[PDB]
Amino acid sequence: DDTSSSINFLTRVTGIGPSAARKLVDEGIKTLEDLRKNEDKLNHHQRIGLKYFEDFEKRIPREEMLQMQDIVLNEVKKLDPEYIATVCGSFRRGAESSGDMDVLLTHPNFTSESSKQPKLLHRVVEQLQKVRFITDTLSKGETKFMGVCQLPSENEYPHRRIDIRLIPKDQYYCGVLYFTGSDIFNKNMRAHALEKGFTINEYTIRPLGVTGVAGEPLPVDSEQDIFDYIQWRYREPKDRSE
Ligand SMILES: [Mn+2]
Ligand SMILES: [Mn+2]
Numbered sequence: 001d002d003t004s005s006s007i008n009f010l011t012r013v014t015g016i017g018p019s020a021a022r023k024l025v026d027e028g029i030k031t032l033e034d035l036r037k038n039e040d041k042l043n044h045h046q047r048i049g050l051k052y053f054e055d056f057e058k059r060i061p062r063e064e065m066l067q068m069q070d071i072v073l074n075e076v077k078k079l080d081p082e083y084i085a086t087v088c089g090s091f092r093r094g095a096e097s098s099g100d101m102d103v104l105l106t107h108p109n110f111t112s113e114s115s116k117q118p119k120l121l122h123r124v125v126e127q128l129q130k131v132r133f134i135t136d137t138l139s140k141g142e143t144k145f146m147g148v149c150q151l152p153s154e155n156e157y158p159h160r161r162i163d164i165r166l167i168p169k170d171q172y173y174c175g176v177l178y179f180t181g182s183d184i185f186n187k188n189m190r191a192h193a194l195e196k197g198f199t200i201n202e203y204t205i206r207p208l209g210v211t212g213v214a215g216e217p218l219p220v221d222s223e224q225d226i227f228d229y230i231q232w233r234y235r236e237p238k239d240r241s242e
Pocket of ligand 2: 055157158159
């Protein structure tokens with residue numbers, strides 16, 4: 001009812017999951033002013049979401065993402081040019097506006113065999129924070145970081161969501177592909193690959209076999225190699241709507 005209407009509002013909060021939104025109702029937390037008066041019931045994540053609830057509802061204009069991406073890129077280069085960093089999402093596809101910035105990141109040092117190099121990501125984050133670009137963190141794993149950022153005012157920008165992922169270099173490409181979408185796109189493509197006897201995922205492309213349950217990741221060094229294995233002309237991201 002007008003109360004279910006309540007849980008619906010909660011979940012609008014980044015961090016607030018249903019079961020998590022639910023209990024807060026059983027606590028008599030419904031509107032938002034409720035929540036502000038009740039930070040203590042919330043985790044760091046949720047607190048942040050709450051913190052930026054408004055802004056988080058606003059969309060990112062690509063004139064904005066552009067500058068974002070430049071900042072992110074120039075910072076990572078200065079730390080180690082051997083760093084690969086690509087802003088994926090519809091944004092990559094040319095989208096006129098975006099919801100959040102999401103950066104895929106890699107390094108040759110780091111590969112699907114290593115698997116343990118937090119410092120790799122961390123250093124970036126830190127450099128970003130030092131920059132005053134990242135501004136808060138919702139969470140922050142060895143391999144992933146979700147947070148907030150903001151362009152630099154000279155006089156102000158909204159705070160945006162940002163995600164940074166660390167992928168082993170031998171998996172990066174697929175991943176870039178993958179986070180590039182669109183979803184149909186991925187779908188049609190894995191579909192195709194399959195015709196051609198190949199199985200793709202966000203991590204790797206693999207040849208199938210008899211009975212079907214098969215594989216063993218082919219080497220990828222670019223998105224192109226993906227398309228090449230499946231012998232499909234290469235689609236630049238803009239041409240990826242489907
Ligand atoms: Mn995202
Ligand atoms: Mn703001």
